[model samples]
Target chain A: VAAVVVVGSCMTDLVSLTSRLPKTGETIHGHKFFIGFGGKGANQCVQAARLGAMTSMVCKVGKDSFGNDYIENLKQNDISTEFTYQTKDAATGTASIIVNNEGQNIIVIVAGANLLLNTEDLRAAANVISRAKVMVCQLEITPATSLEALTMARRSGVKTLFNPAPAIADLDPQFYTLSDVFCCNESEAEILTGLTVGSAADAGEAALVLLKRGCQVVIITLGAEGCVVLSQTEPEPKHIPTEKVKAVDTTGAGDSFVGALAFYLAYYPNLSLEDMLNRSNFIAAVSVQAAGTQSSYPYKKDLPLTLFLEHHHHH
Target chain B: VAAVVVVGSCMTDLVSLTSRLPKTGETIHGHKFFIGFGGKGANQCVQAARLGAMTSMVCKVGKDSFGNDYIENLKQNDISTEFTYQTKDAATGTASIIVNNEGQNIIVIVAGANLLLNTEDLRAAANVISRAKVMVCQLEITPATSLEALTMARRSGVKTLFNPAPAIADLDPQFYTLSDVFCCNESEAEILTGLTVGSAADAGEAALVLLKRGCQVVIITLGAEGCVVLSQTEPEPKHIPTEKVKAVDTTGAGDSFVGALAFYLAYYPNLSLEDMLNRSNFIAAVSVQAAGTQSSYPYKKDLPLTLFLEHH
Candidate 1:
C-alpha cells in the first residue's frame, strides 16, 4: 500500500531567460529556454517520494506530448502512476514563464487537462485511497475533485492534509471540516480568513478562525519568520522556529514542507505536532537553499539520520 | 521517384498577440498566444506535399516534447520522416513571434536543432537524394549542409532549385553555380547581386549578372506586378505577368510558387520554362487570397483542372 497519495495537477514549466524585454511587436533573441516539471500536487508527491515515502500520484494529464513527459518524470521520481490518467480532449497543463536578467518574471498558465480530473477518476482509484495512510491535496485541480478526494479519504479514516493555495474565496464550508490539517502560507491565510497575517500573532488569529470553521488543525507559514500552528491537542497556537538559511530559489519550498509533514504524520503518529512542523521546516529550509523544484528536495540518504527516527506506530 | 527533396529546417511557431510592450523588470499580461508549424524549408516542403508530390523532409529535432510533436506533425502532412531525426542535444527550432495592433510583428527564431543538420545527415539521406526528380533547399540551415546536398544532387543529375532567402550577403559563390534554377524575391536578388531590382527592367539586368555566374536559369519574383526570368533556353530576359488578383494573406505565397515550380519541373519535363513559370504564378496568386502559410497552400484537387494539365 502507498503511504502518501497526492491528487492534484502536473504542469510543464516552459521558461525563457532574456536580457531585456521586447517592445510590442518587436522580436529580440532570448538567452535560453528550458522546461521543468511542476504543479503543487506533483511537487508535494515528488518531495514525499524523495524522502523515501511509498508515494502515489493521482492526477489527469492530456494524451499530448507534455503529458507523456510528465508521466516519465513521475516514474523517474519513483512515484506510482497507477492513478495518473490521460484524456484526449485537452492539452497538458503548462506555465509559460519569461524571466529577465534582474529575476523579474511574467507568467501565463493554462490549466488544461488538470481541470478535467473528476469524480470518475477518483472512483477508479478507490482501492488506493482505501489503503493509503495519508492523502494530500491542493487547489490546483478542480475544486469539486479536491473535495471528492478529501471526502473519500476521510471516509476511509485516512488523514487529510489540505492546502487551499491559490486560494479562492467563498470556498465550500465542507472543505474546512473535511480537512484534518488545513495549511496555507501567509498570503493564503489572509485571503481565506480575511485577516492580515504579517506577524506570528496575526497568524495565530488566522489559525483560530480556521479552527472554529471546523479544521482540526491550522498552520500558517511565514517566510523567513517561520510558522505558527494551532491543533486540537495543543492549548494555544505554537510557533515552530527553523534555522534561517539563505534561499536560492524558494520555488517549491512550501511543497517540501507539506510532503515532509505528510511523511511525519504517517510514520511518527506519536510525535508532537510542534516537533513534526519543526522537522518539516528544516527539510523545507534545505529545499530553498538550492535551485529548481524537485531537484532541490532533500533525499532521505543525504539528510541527518536523527530526523528519520520513527516516533509512532507503523502500519 | 520522389518528386521533391527539401533538405532543410522545421521550426515550431509560438506566436503571441499583445497590445503593448513589457518594460524591463516588469510583467504585463498578454492577450493571446498560439502555435503554428513553420520554417523556410518546411514551408516550401509543405506546399510541395499539399500538391500531392512525393516529398521527404530531412532535418533534426530535439528529443524533447516539441521535437516529438514536430515529427507527428510532419507525418500527418503525409511527408516522409525517414530522415527527420531527433537529437537529444537541442530542441526543435522555434520562431517566437509577437504581433501588435498595427499588424507589425517582432520575431526571434532559435535555430536549435536546425543548426545541427550536417553533411553526415545529408550522406545518410543519399538514397532519397539519388532517386529524387528535383532537390529544393533554403538558407535556414548551415550553408555547408546546403552546399553538400546541392553537390550530391548535382552529381546525381537531379535538378536543383535554390532559394537564397533571408539573404546572406557573403554566401559562397558556388551556391550561384550549383543552382540549375536560382530563385529569390527582389530583395534577395538585390542583396546577392548588389544591384537594384525595383523594375522589371532592373530585375532583367539583375538576372543577367546571376546568369554570368553560371546559373542556367534565374528567376526574381516581384509581388503584385509579376516576375522576371532569364533562362539559357530563352534568347533574352522574359517577363511573365500574372493576373492581378486581390491577395488576402500572402504569408507563404513565394513558397507556394517555389513548390509549384518544383512540381512542374519534375512532372512536366517537356513543358517550356516560360509556361511553367506562368502556371506556377497562378498557383502562387491563389495562395495570396487566403491566410496562413502552408495552411493557405492550394491543394491539387482544389485548383483548376487546366492548371494541372501537362503542357509543352
Candidate 2:
C-alpha cells in the first residue's frame, strides 16, 4: 500500500575518470576509480522516496556483497525492499564506465542479476502493486514483468507511469494500454512513435501518435529545452519549460523526471497535468546541475517549501 | 635453496572481448567477459615454474577473493607462495582490459596491493634470496623495493636478473651495479638508456651503454626480430635469432623470456650466455603464438626432451 511502487533493476556502476580515451592496444593511467549504484528502476524509485512518497521496490539481486550493500542502500533511502529477492544464480549487474575529462563517457554493462527479474517476482509483489497510488517502471528488466506490474496497478485504479528508456524494439501492445502516463525521452520517442523529435513541435506530433494508442497522457522529455505534454483531459500539447541551468552530467536526468512525475501523481493527483510536468521538469533540471545519479536527486528539504506547503494545503 | 626466486606483483586481469572499442558516451555489448591471473612478476614466476625450475614468489596481494585465488593459482602452477603476503590495507591489483575484434585493446590498471611490496618484505625473504641460484625482479613494484631485493641477492653471490618493465624515469644507479643480467624489451631500453631502439643495431648500441654502468650482461629484446646481447664475458654484441612465428598475442612475451632465462641460469649455469639467450628466445617465440599470459606459457611436459636431457 505504498504511494509509489517501482519494479526494476539494481546495478553497480564502476566508473573511472581518465585524462583521455586510450587508443586500441594502449594502456593509459586513469585519474581515479570509484563505484556507485544505478539502475533505471531503482533510480526512479529512490527519487520518489526522497520526495516524501511511500515507496517500495520490487527487484532481484545476487546474493553477493554488492547485493547486500544495495539492500542497505534502499533501506537508508527509506524505500521498502520487501520484494527485493536475492538469487544464488547470478552476480549483481555491473556497468563499467570510462569517462574522459570532457564529460564524455563510454560504458559496458553486464545485465547479470538484472535479467533474473521475472513475472513470478511481480506476482509475489502483487499486493504492493495493487495498493500503490503510482507505480513506475522502465526497460531495464523484462518487458513482460514490467507490463504485468503496470497491469496489476491499473487493475486497482492506481496510476502507472511507463518510461520506455533504453528502448526495446517490438514492445508488447499491452504496455501502451497499461500505462496511465507514457513518458519517454526524444530518442525513445523516435523509436516508439517512428517520428523525428528535433523540436517541441515534433515531440507534440509524436505525443499525438501515442495518444491514439490507448494512452491517457503522453510526455516527451526534451533535454535542456524541457518536455512536451499531451493529455486526454487537455487535447492541446503544452511545453512545460524549466529554468535554464548549467548541466555537468545528465546521467540520471530522465529517471529523475520520471520519479518526480510519479511523486506528483501520487500526492498531488488533483493538480493539472501541466503543473505536474512543470514541477517535475524543475526537479530534473536541478538534478542535471549536480553530478552522479541518485546523488544528484534533490531531497524534499532541498526543494522549495512551496511543494510541502501545496501538499499540506491539499491535505 | 630455491633454484629460481622472483620478487614482484600479482594482479587479477579482468578482460572483456567486444566487437569494437566503445566511443565516447557509447555503450556496447561485449562478446564475452573473463578473469585471469596476470602481473609482470607473477607472469614471469609462473613461466619459470612451468619450465621445471623450483621457484618462490615474494609479493603482496590483498586479503580479497581475487588475492586468495591468486595464491592457489600460484601453488597450482607449482610456484611457491612462501613470501606472498596478504595485506588488509588494500584490495587486489587489477588490470581492466577491453579488447576489440581486431585484436586491439585499451587497458587501465590499479596497482592496489602490488604497491605494498616494501623493503621489509625483502628482508623477510633474505634467507631464501641468499640461497637461490637465480633471482628475478621487475618494475611492477616500487623501484626501491625491487632494488633492495636485487641488492640482497647480489650480496649473497646470487645471479640477479632485472627486467625494467613499465619503466620509470631517473632509475636508480644501484640497479645497473646490482644486476648480473639486465634484460629489457626495446621499449624499456629506450626509457632506461634514453636511446631510441628501432632495430637490432639500435638495441645493440643501447645494450653497450647499459653495459658500461657495471652490468655483466645486457639483453635488449626485440619483438619478432629476436634479441640483441652484449656481455663482459663476450664483449662482441651478438644477435640471437629466433624462428618466425605468427603472434596471436604478445602480452606476456617479455615476462616469458625473462622467466625462461632465469630457468636456464638456474639449471644450465655452465652454458654460454648466447646459448641461453637463443634458448629463451625460442621459448618466448612459442609463447606469442598462443593467447593469454600464463595459459600460453609452455609446461615442462610440453617442452623438448633435450632441455631436460641437456640439463641432466
Candidate 3:
C-alpha cells in the first residue's frame, strides 16, 4: 500500500460535446458524448497508485449503482476504498461537463454527499494520515475537513501538498505557511496571490509571490508550457520543459503531477523541495499523451525512461 | 412551438468508465466522470427541434438542479416547456451508464419520477395531443401514460412513434396497433418477439411477428449494418443503410431517427407509410456521425443530400 492519503470530492462525469458552450437563446449541435470516471480526490489517489504509492481515498457516494460503481472503480486502480462511505439519502456527486472544440470546458457540479464530508471523518483518519508519508488535500472537500487533515498531518510532521481548487476568495495565510509545497496552476496561483502569470517568467514571479508569503517551496504549473519552480532564496525560477504530445482532455493532468511528486518524494527524501517539483513536471508531460485524468497516468516502467528523456533529450 | 407532445422520463446520467466491459467481477481502471442530462422523452424533443419541428414536451422533473437543468436544456433546444411540470417530492430519473472499448454500453436507469407517470398526466395533455401533427412516446415513461397518450392520439388520428427500450414482458396489446410505426433495435426486437434475428431477413421476420399483432409497420434498426424495414403484408424486408461516419456513441441515435420520422410525417403528409420509414431510416444515418443521443440529430440543410448519398 502506498503511504499517501488523498481527500476530496469523488464522483462520476457525464460529458457532452457542443460546438461551443451554449448561449441562453441559442441552440448548437452536440458532437461527442462521453461518460468517464472523475473527481479531484479520486484522481489524486489513482495518480499516486500508478506512481507506486499505496494510496487510500476517503469520500462518500450513494447506495445505488453509482455508489457501487465508484467503490469498484477505486479498487481496480489499486487505491484502498475502505474509507468510502455509502449514504442512502444523498446521491453521489456529479458534474455536467460541456467541452468546446477549443478545449475549454464549463462544469456545473452538484455536491451530493461530497458536501457531507465532516471534520470528524478526518479526525478518525488521523492514524492513517499520521502513518502516511504525505497527506494531500484539495478544496473540493469541505474547508473544515481539509484544514483538519492538514493540521493533523502537520502535527504528525507528515508532509502536506495542497491544491486549492474551487479556489476560495479569501484564504488564511497560515495555511500557506503550513504547506510543505504549494502547488497550483496559473489560475489557482492568481486566486491566492491576486495576480496573473501567463508564461514561465511570469510564473517565476508568481512562485515568488507564494514563497514570500512563507510557503517553503512554490511551484506554478503552466499547463503545456511547463512549470516554474521557486524557493525562498533562489532569485530565478527553474524552467521545467514540457514534453510535446497531443493533449486530448487535460482534465486530470495537474492532479497527476502533484500525486507523482508526493510519491517520488519518499525516494528522493534528501532532494530540495524545488528539485522534487521539477521532477513532477516531467511525469505530467508523459501524462498528457493519453486521455482522461487517472486513466492517462503512466505506469512505473514508463517513469524512469520519462525522467531520463527529460534530462537527456534535446541535449 | 411545433406540434409534437412527448410523454416520458426526465433524468440525469451517472456513468463510470472501463477500457473494456468487465466480466462477472473483473475490474478495470476508469478515472474520469460526469453527470449530464438524459431521458428518451427529453432527447427526442431536442432532436425534433434540431430538425425544425416546433415541439412541446410534457414530463416530470424534481424541483432540483437536475430537474431545473432539464427544463433549461429543453428551452435552449427550442422546445416549449409550458407543459413541463415540476413535482415537489420526486427527483428526476437517473441512469448508470458504462461504456467499454468495443463501443458497447450497459445502462441501468432508475424509474424515479418516470415511474410516477399516470393516466392523469397523459390525459392532462389531451388538448396538446389533439392539435399535434404527431405524438412521441417511449418506454422511459410508464406504460399507463404511454397507453393514455396512444389512446388519445388514435382517437384524434395523430401519428404515433414508439421506441421500446428496456422492453418489458407485461405490456398490453392495444399499444402495438396504436402506433403508426413501431421502432425498436434488434436486441429489443428479440426480447419482444422472443426470437433471435441474426440477419436482415430475420429482422424482417421479427417485424412481421409484431405486424401480425395488428401493427401497421415495424422497423428494426441494426447498428453499423443499417436498419431493416418491414411493413404489413410485405414478404421481404427492405434494407436501409445508415452508413454515416462510424458512430462514437449509438446512444439516442435511434431516438433521433424516430423524432425525425415523426417530424417529417407532419411535412410530407402524402408519402406512403413505407416511404416515410425509409426517410426516417436515412436521417438516423446522419446522427451516428456525432455522439450523445440528441447531440447527433441532423438539421434540415443536410437532409436532401443525406438522403441522396447511397454509401453512408
Candidate 4:
C-alpha cells in the first residue's frame, strides 16, 4: 500500500585508496580498501523507507552473495524486494571507486545482473505500479525497461518522476515527455536542456524549457546555492537556497535530494507544485546536514512539521 | 651465531572463498574472506630460525602500517628484520589467495617494492653474507640479484643453498654450479633435468646427474610421500617418507624442509653429506606434523634428540 515505486539497479562497490591514479606501466601503492553495497536504485529505495514513504523497490541483483545480502538489507528496511530478480549468468553488479586527496572520484563499474533486467520483471510488477500514487525511476538499469515501466505507469494515471542521473545525452525523448516531475542537478539540467544553469537565472531558464516539454513541474538542484522550481503556468520560478556544511563524500548527495523530493511529492499531492518544491528543498538541506546518501535521509518522525507552518515566524 | 644468511620478501595475505573462477563475460561470486601476514622469503627465514639456525632476513617493506606490523610479527618469532630496507614507494607486498573446499589454491601477488630490490641492497648486505658460515637464497625476488648473492656466498667459501621456487627454467648455468645444495620440488626437478622421475631408480639417477653438474647435494621434496636426498659421496640415495597429517593449506610446506636442512647443516658442517641428509629428513618429519611453514617447524626443545628414542 505504498504511494511510490522506485526502480534502479543494485551494485556492490569496491573502493580503494589512491595517492594518485596509476598510469600505464606505473604501479602506485594503495593505503587501504573497503567494499560496500551500493547502487542508485538501492539508495533511493532506502531513502524513501527512511522518510516513512510506503515504498517498494524494483531492481535486479545477481543470485550470488551480493544479491542475497542486498535483498536481505532491503527487507530489513521494509522495502519490497519481491520484484528484484536473481539471474544465474549475470553476477551482482559492482563498482570500483578510487578517491584521491582532492576528492575527485574515478569509477569503474562491472554491470552484472543489473543489465539483464528484462520486460518480464516490469510486466510482473505492473499491478503494484498501477496502485501507486507516484512512480520514480533512475538510469542505473536499461532505459528500454525503464521506458516500459514508465509507459505502464502513465496508462494507469500514476505520476512518473524520472531522475536521469549519470547524464547520458541520448535517452529516449518519450521519457522526457512522459515525466510528470523531472528532477535533475544543475549539471544534468544543462546537459539535457543545453541551458547553462551556473546561476539561478540559468536554473530558471532550464526549468522554463522543461515546463515547455508539457511537464507539470521542473526542479533543478543547484548544490549549496539552492534549487529552482518552475511550472507550466507559474512564470516566476521559486528559489530555495541551502546552508553550507563540510562534505566528506558527495557520492550519494544528489540521490538523497531526489529521494527526498520523490517522498515529499507523494505526501503532498494536493499542494501547489511550487510549495512542493520548497518543502523538497528543505528536506534536501536536512539531507546534506547528515552524511552518506541513504544514511543521511531524515526519518518521518525527525521532521518538524512546524517548519512547514506559515504561521511560524521564528526569524 | 647462525651459519646462513636468509633474506627475501614479506607479505600480508588476504584470502577469500571462491567456488569457481569466472568465465569470460560470465560472473561468479565469493562469500567470505580472511587476512593474514606471510611472505616466501619471510617464511623461509623464520623457518630456518625455528629449526635452530642463526637467521636474519633482508628485504624491503613499505614504511607504512602493514610493513611495521609485519616486522613486529617476524621479531616475535626469533627472526630479525633489522637489515630489511624500509621504502616509501609502495605498500608492503600482498597476496590474494582464493581457496575452494577441495583445497585448490590460486595465488595472485602484487610485488610492490619487492621488485624494486636493486644491486644496491645486495651490496649493502654484502658484509653480512661475508660473515655468515653459509648463505641461503630463494628466487622470490629479482632472480638476477639472487644469482649475485649466491655467487658472492660461494666465492666467500660459504655454502650457498638455493630453493628456486615458482621455478625459473632458464637461469644461468653458473648459478647451478655455484649452489652447494640445490633443493627443488618434483616439478622443479623435472624442469631442470627435463626428465620426470617415475620410480625410485629414476630419482636416484636424476639426483646423481644434478650432483655431477656441480651441486654438492640434491634434495627433491615429494609431499606426503617424503623426500629424496643424494650427495656426491653418499653411499646411496635416502628416501625419507612423510608423517601423516591433515593439511589445511600447503603454502609453506617446502620452506620447512629447507629451514631444517640449513639449521642442522650449519651446526654439523663436518658430517658426511649423506649423514647430513638423514638428519635433515628427520627434521622435515617434525615439520609436516604441524601447520603453516615456519609456524610448524619444531624447536630443538620440541623434537626428540633422535627419532628412535621417542618411537622405541
Best candidate, lDDT: 2
lDDT of each: 0.85, 0.86, 0.74, 0.72
| Superior candidate under TM-score, 2 versus 4 | 2
Across A1-315, the per-residue lDDT of candidate 3 in tens digits comes to: 448888787877766665555532232335445457888888877877877778888787877566788899899988888678788877787765656677655454666778787887777776788888888888876787888878888899988888877676698777787788788888888788888767788788878878888887778888888788777677578877766667775768888888878776644566655566666777777788787777788877676754423232231
- State the fnat of model 3: 0.01
| Pairs in clash, predicted candidate 1 | A27-B106
For each predicted model, how many residue pairs clash, with residues at least 3 apart or on different chains?
1, 2, 19, 1
CAPRI band of model 4?
incorrect
Give me the displacement of residue B231 in model 1, in angstroms.
7.5
DockQ of each: 0.30, 0.44, 0.03, 0.04
Q: Stretches of candidate 1 above 4 Å error?
A: A21-23, A26-31, A169-174, A187-214, A231-239, A246-248, A311-315, B12-37, B63-86, B95-108, B123-133, B151-159, B164-254, B269-298
Best-to-worst ranking by DockQ: 2, 1, 4, 3
In angstroms, how far off is B237's CA in candidate 1? 9.8
* Candidate 4 chain A lowest-lDDT run of ten: A306-315
- B1-312 per-residue lDDT for model 1 (tens digits): 577899988988765555654454443334555567888888888788888899999988888768888888888889999999899887788876655555666566678889899999899999899999999999988889999999999999999999987787788999988999999999889998899889889999999988888898999999877799987777388898888999777777888899889888887878888889898899999999886777888899898888778734
What is the C-alpha lDDT profile of model 1 across A1-315, one tens digit per residue? 798999998988767777765555455556577779999999999999888889999999988777998999999989999999998887777766667687776655667788989999999999999899999999989999999999999999999999998787788999999999999999999899888888999899989999989999999998777799998777398888889998898999999999999988877778888888888999999999999998999999999987888545343
Who is ahead in TM-score, 3 or 4? Answer: 4
By TM-score, who's the top model here?
A: 2
What shift in Å separates residue B43 of candidate 2 from its native position after superposition? 2.3
lDDT measured at residue A287 in model 1 versus the true structure, 0 to 100: 95
Q: Is candidate 1 or candidate 4 better by TM-score?
A: 1
Task: Give stretches of model 3 more than 4 Å off.
Answer: A25-32, A100-104, A233-236, A305-315, B1-312
Query: Candidate 4 at residue A136, lDDT?
Result: 89
User: Per-residue lDDT of B1-312 in model 4, one digit per residue for the tens?
Assistant: 546687667877655455653322332445544346677678777767765677778788888756777788778777756577878887677764545556565444566667667778888877778888768777767777778888788777888888877665676677678788889888777777778875555676677767777787788877666678887677378786655656655667677667766765676676655455556666666666664555666677777777212221
